[PDB]
Amino acid sequence: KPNIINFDTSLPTSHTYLGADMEEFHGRTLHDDDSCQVIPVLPQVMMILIPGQTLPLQLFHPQEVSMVRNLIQKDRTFAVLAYSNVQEREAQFGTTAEIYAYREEQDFGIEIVKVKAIGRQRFKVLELRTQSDGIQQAKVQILPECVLPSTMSAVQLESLNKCQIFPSKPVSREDQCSYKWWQKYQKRKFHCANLTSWPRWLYSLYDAETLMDRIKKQLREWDENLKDDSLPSNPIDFSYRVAACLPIDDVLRIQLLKIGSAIQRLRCELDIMNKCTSLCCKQCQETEITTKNEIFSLSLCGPMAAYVNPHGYVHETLTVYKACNLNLIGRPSTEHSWFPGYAWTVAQCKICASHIGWKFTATKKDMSPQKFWGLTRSALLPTIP
Amino acid sequence: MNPPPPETSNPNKPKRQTNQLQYLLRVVLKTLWKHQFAWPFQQPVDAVKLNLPDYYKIIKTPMDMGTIKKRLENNYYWNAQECIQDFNTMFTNCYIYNKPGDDIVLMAEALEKLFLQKINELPTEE
Amino acid sequence: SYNYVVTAQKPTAVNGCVTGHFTSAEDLNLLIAKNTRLEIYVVTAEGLRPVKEVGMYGKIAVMELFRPKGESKDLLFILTAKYNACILEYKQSGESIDIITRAHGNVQDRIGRPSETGIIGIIDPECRMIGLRLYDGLFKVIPLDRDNKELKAFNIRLEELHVIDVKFLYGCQAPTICFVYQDPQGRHVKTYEVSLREKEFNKGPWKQENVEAEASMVIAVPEPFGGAIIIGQESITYHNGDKYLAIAPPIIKQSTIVCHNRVDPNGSRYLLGDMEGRLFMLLLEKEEQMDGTVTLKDLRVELLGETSIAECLTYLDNGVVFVGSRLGDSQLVKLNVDSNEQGSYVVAMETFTNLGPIVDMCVVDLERQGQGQLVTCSGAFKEGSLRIIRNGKLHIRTVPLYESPRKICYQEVSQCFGVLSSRIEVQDTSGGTTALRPSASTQALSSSVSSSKLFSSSTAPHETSFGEEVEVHNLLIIDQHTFEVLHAHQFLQNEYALSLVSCKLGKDPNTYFIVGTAMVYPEEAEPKQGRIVVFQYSDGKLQTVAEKEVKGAVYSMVEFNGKLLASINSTVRLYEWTTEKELRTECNHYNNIMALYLKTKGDFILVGDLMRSVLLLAYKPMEGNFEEIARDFNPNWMSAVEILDDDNFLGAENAFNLFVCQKDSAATTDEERQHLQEVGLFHLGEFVNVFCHGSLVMQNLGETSTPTQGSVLFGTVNGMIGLVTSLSESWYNLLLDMQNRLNKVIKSVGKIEHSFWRSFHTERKTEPATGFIDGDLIESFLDISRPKMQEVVANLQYDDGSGMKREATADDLIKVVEELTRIH
Ligand SMILES: Cc1sc2c(c1C)[C@H](c1ccc(Cl)cc1)N[C@@H](CC(=O)NCCCCCCCCC(=O)N[C@@H](C)C(=O)N[C@H]1CCC(=O)NC1=O)c1nnc(C)n1-2
Numbered sequence A: 001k002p003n004i005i006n007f008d009t010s011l012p013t014s015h016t017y018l019g020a021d022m023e024e025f026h027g028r029t030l031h032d033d034d035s036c037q038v039i040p041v042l043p044q045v046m047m048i049l050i051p052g053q054t055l056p057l058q059l060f061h062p063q064e065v066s067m068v069r070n071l072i073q074k075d076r077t078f079a080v081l082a083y084s085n086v087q088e089r090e091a092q093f094g095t096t097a098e099i100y101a102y103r104e105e106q107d108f109g110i111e112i113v114k115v116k117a118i119g120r121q122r123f124k125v126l127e128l129r130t131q132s133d134g135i136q137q138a139k140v141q142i143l144p145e146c147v148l149p150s151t152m153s154a155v156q157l158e159s160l161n162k163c164q165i166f167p168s169k170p171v172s173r174e175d176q177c178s179y180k181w182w183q184k185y186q187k188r189k190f191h192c193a194n195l196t197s198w199p200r201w202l203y204s205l206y207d208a209e210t211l212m213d214r215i216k217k218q219l220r221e222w223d224e225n226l227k228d229d230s231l232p233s234n235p236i237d238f239s240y241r242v243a244a245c246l247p248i249d250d251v252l253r254i255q256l257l258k259i260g261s262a263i264q265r266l267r268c269e270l271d272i273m274n275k276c277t278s279l280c281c282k283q284c285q286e287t288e289i290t291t292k293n294e295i296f297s298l299s300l301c302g303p304m305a306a307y308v309n310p311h312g313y314v315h316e317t318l319t320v321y322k323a324c325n326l327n328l329i330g331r332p333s334t335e336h337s338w339f340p341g342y343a344w345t346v347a348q349c350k351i352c353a354s355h356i357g358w359k360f361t362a363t364k365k366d367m368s369p370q371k372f373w374g375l376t377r378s379a380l381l382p383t384i385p
Numbered sequence B: 001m002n003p004p005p006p007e008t009s010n011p012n013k014p015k016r017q018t019n020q021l022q023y024l025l026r027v028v029l030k031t032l033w034k035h036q037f038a039w040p041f042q043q044p045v046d047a048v049k050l051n052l053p054d055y056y057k058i059i060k061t062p063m064d065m066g067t068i069k070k071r072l073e074n075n076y077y078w079n080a081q082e083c084i085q086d087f088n089t090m091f092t093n094c095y096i097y098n099k100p101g102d103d104i105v106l107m108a109e110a111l112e113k114l115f116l117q118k119i120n121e122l123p124t125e126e
Numbered sequence C: 001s002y003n004y005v006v007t008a009q010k011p012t013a014v015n016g017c018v019t020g021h022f023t024s025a026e027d028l029n030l031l032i033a034k035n036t037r038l039e040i041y042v043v044t045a046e047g048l049r050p051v052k053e054v055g056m057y058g059k060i061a062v063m064e065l066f067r068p069k070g071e072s073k074d075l076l077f078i079l080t081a082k083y084n085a086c087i088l089e090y091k092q093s094g095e096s097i098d099i100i101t102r103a104h105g106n107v108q109d110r111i112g113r114p115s116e117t118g119i120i121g122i123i124d125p126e127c128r129m130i131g132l133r134l135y136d137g138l139f140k141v142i143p144l145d146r147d148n149k150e151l152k153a154f155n156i157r158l159e160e161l162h163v164i165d166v167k168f169l170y171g172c173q174a175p176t177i178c179f180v181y182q183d184p185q186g187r188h189v190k191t192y193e194v195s196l197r198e199k200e201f202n203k204g205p206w207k208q209e210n211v212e213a214e215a216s217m218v219i220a221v222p223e224p225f226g227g228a229i230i231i232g233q234e235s236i237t238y239h240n241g242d243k244y245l246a247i248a249p250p251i252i253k254q255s256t257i258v259c260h261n262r263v264d265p266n267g268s269r270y271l272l273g274d275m276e277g278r279l280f281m282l283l284l285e286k287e288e289q290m291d292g293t294v295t296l297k298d299l300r301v302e303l304l305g306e307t308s309i310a311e312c313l314t315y316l317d318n319g320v321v322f323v324g325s326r327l328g329d330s331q332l333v334k335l336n337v338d339s340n341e342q343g344s345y346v347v348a349m350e351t352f353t354n355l356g357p358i359v360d361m362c363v364v365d366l367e368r369q370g371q372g373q374l375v376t377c378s379g380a381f382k383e384g385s386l387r388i389i390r391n392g393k394l395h396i397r398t399v400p401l402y403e404s405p406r407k408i409c410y411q412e413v414s415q416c417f418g419v420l421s422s423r424i425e426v427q428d429t430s431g432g433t434t435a436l437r438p439s440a441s442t443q444a445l446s447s448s449v450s451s452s453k454l455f456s457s458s459t460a461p462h463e464t465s466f467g468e469e470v471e472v473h474n475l476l477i478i479d480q481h482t483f484e485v486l487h488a489h490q491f492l493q494n495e496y497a498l499s500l501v502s503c504k505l506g507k508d509p510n511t512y513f514i515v516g517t518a519m520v521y522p523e524e525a526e527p528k529q530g531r532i533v534v535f536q537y538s539d540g541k542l543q544t545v546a547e548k549e550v551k552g553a554v555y556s557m558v559e560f561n562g563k564l565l566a567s568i569n570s571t572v573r574l575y576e577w578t579t580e581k582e583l584r585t586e587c588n589h590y591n592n593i594m595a596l597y598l599k600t601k602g603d604f605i606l607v608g609d610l611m612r613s614v615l616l617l618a619y620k621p622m623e624g625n626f627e628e629i630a631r632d633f634n635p636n637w638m639s640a641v642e643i644l645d646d647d648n649f650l651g652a653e654n655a656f657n658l659f660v661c662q663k664d665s666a667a668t669t670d671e672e673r674q675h676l677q678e679v680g681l682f683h684l685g686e687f688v689n690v691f692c693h694g695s696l697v698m699q700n701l702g703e704t705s706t707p708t709q710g711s712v713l714f715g716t717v718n719g720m721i722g723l724v725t726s727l728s729e730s731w732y733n734l735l736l737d738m739q740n741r742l743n744k745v746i747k748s749v750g751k752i753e754h755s756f757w758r759s760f761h762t763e764r765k766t767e768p769a770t771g772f773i774d775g776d777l778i779e780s781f782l783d784i785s786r787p788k789m790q791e792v793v794a795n796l797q798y799d800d801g802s803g804m805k806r807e808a809t810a811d812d813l814i815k816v817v818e819e820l821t822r823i824h
């Protein structure tokens, strides 16, 4: 955990390897809540998109290129099915993805389309139909996202309304500024708990701000260098960002996607965070690679994000400081680098000789991270007893 | 297991330096060499370290652009067809050993397309 | 499912009170708002004489009296929680009394989020407009003319989005407001000028100034002085543009001042009340500068005495002050020039009963007749007590405790009650063992203290400071004849008592008290330790039989066919009472929610959480394990849940609503059979805390062929007690038709529609009520005239055969309604 990072953590966000003269769009479109719409689904994609997460793509097949070209004009949004119920095209929920970057090349007479898309509203899969062209246009119902008022907004006394605006939180994060302030906040916000049948701490267990504070505490305990700057302030965006960065298996991600309440999602994320222990090789099932304490963020989008290989394959990479039981094969290469400034060898499980990830080594001598590893999500098994 | 690629500069075999051979030596060879993908296909595949204990079993004859450039610079080839065939086998001995869709395989194919467009403009017979 | 809901006790808590000349030009009136009820009194030398009481289709939020120019008496402006606004006038024609609606309208914004400091409503001193602050960033102005009969209003954008308080100023030639807001740099006081022609704010008369970080109250001083008074945590300040005056009295530092009232018409004196029952007097001293102008010389505060915890204050006359309370009984007090032996200037005169808040209750039969009695846990802090309600009107007997009762249960064999209480103690010097005042737990016949050592190496960080408040929890044994505290048992330090039950377990012929606790520490968020204790009360001494330490918080406990069903964190566990007088775990069920609510009927278990997650389980006897039958997850806030029948469940939802779920076991697929269907929606208007089965009538006789089945009682925060019973389809249809044709002849105060009032309301969605019959509207049928009866019952067909008894005569429905009224 060196002492400092001098690397611009805003660089692995624009995906400079994909290109530079991207045709960007601004128009944001959200349809409604609880309606039925039919929208194309990209094939060859095996992932779950959490809302607010970005997705880079490289497409070669003529049908996908043609349908993306058509989709650019109509609404710029497609569907990313969960595809997690087994693997035989069983889908129940999915995420809408909107495109905000687009370019086309020629190559060796084969059209290549590079696209960056971001996650949006969730839906549920009702009916799926397959078209001869290749696009599996499906009928889905947009799942609604709801916010809830304060627990005391109904039982609060009118004479204490003027005392509901607390002074600004102190910035010196320390005791007597966190503990004392939070104690007074609990005592003043949930004073009307004496009018009900439940204590004050029970109501604090369902308070959004307290849950976000606890999640931030644990995140900073894992990532000491990480500061309370990049994390959002809205409960919904905060919950989605936390969900899109936990090194968990697929079932937990599905169950987090099913939840339609920010508070329930925050509580489930807290439980999962309390449960996570380590990661192991998927094929070997026993070889342990790295622990959660070594997870650290080189990007402002969290420790985990999705990138695209030079051939179209999308990998979700988790950055760690150290890795174990890995053997490197090949010569360090510096092309299509996802972290501008580093080089990438290919790493493979030392036992089953399966690809786990890459080891990115710095080129310039004056760079604080001199060697950090990247681990593919669909190559590791969460080792929770 | 671990046989050196075909020997450079076969002395018994006679050699002609033709303009087609020089085209192969410079425009084809160097352009193939300076490619972001042609980094594995340029040194004799080492199955011991890459740990692939069977390649030499499935692959009867091993070779690379390195040894073929060496054979092109040190007088080996009597004509060109030998060199084009050698490069074609260099492609085939990878498509056959690895499986469709993989990465090395998807890389080579690009190299093979580059090679084909390059050699279809080989010099007239001289 | 068809249900009938009626009220037995009207709400008793007071949330507003104003004084003025409403009934007559030469009469002094006191107007009191009690949730949905409005009471009008006339202040006399003897005391208060009731005059008129009315009901409104909503919860009153703003109530003000104003006299527009050209009027001989005050008018009343009312705004409800659903943003219904009206202007009312009092008319007395001979001996009949009626209230006329002179203007009404719904002032609501289709898009907008409700503000954090609540609803604020103010009136110009010269009666030119009404200022409302419903949503953040907007200020609503209603011009006060004789043509604005629909109360049309316009919005003015506010650049400050954290307004705390706002008032209109006296003596300004144009309507001027003064308000306090918070920005990242602190708290400031500004002033604006409201233009009724151009509909925008102008530059105020004074200049923006900085105030205390805890400033919350603004008082507009009348004309002789002018300006405003800002009251904070430790200082009182006076602003008049250029003049400035600040005092920091040490008397007001202990508790926060929350209410105020003006005594003198010229603003010489004011009454201030804090959150602990203290009453203060603020005096303004005047000086003359030989120019005819009067300026303020100094300020001074004085402690008058102690009263109930006040919500509102109103000086009536001759030193008589009305104290309106939500956590206790209201009072009439007298201020004397001299003081008693303790230096207190206040003397109590009258007391008005208040049952709210009701946090727990139970139904017992003390006289061993066929008529039950209701014993509730009411009040909080020093106003907590036990109330015994009989259906003899209702006769209420009060047993003060000077504590906060939380739970109550009855043991018939011992002829006593078990009550969980809580008192607040302050940390003084060495240890926090100082009590604020004598309580029932301290003043008890016998006493005992927990001596357990199960958790001795517990966290206990000892992070305690001087003056810190700590809660002490007790179990009290109370006689059922004299209601005296026979025993008080104190739990361990930092231990929180959550559940209480009385039952017999296994083959043991003894009755026990069983309590489930939770060890709570300030630094941890979720408890990781708990305890279940078994008490036996005999020979006048409480004894501990057994105790079991668990790894969570025991939120609920229910006796399950001779076994104990407990909810530990997110796990439901079943215990057995062995012959060794111990507890042995039988089976566990692991859920994904915290089982706050636990109800049982037969072999079925209803599990619920605070987020309206209803789960239904069944016990398998031959296998000895649980299974899940159905579930219904819908995010909302739930206060209580109850089991009506084998397939119907009743719960209380957010925004004072009621809902009923149903289980359909005739479904074909296992997916339709595994879901609960909503079959009832209703906007009650009250916050329900507890449900219980029972009745207050002579149900022992039970007559024959009752039109209603079942009986469930609930208690609310405002001290209201209601009843819910089930109906048949025919009666439900007839009563629905009766409601529809009754809401066409009854004149509602404020001209609010009944359907809008009873519509299931939440800030996400609004849906019409279904499956519920409003018993109050049905019972109002007897209070109308005979011609109105004939108009209502016109062309209604009912009854068995005979051509549906031709057209139903008014006498038939009169008899039906009288039969319905006998259930409470
Ligand atoms: C010295 C020689 S000779 C030679 C190879 C060698 C290393 C090879 C061989 C295999 C794969 C490669 Cl690519 C090269 C050479 N394997 C042998 C056959 C063999 O053992 N196969 C087993 C594959 C094990 C996992 C391989 C997939 C890994 C995906 C991958 O890493 N893909 C790249 C595009 C990628 O993900 N880049 C990221 C990195 C992060 C970033 O920043 N950017 C990106 O986009 C082979 N076959 N014929 C010949 C010639 N060889």
Ligand SMILES: [Zn+2]
Residues within 6 Å of the ligand: A281, A282, A283, A284, A285, A287, A349, A350, A351, A352, A353, A354
């Ligand atoms: Zn492995």
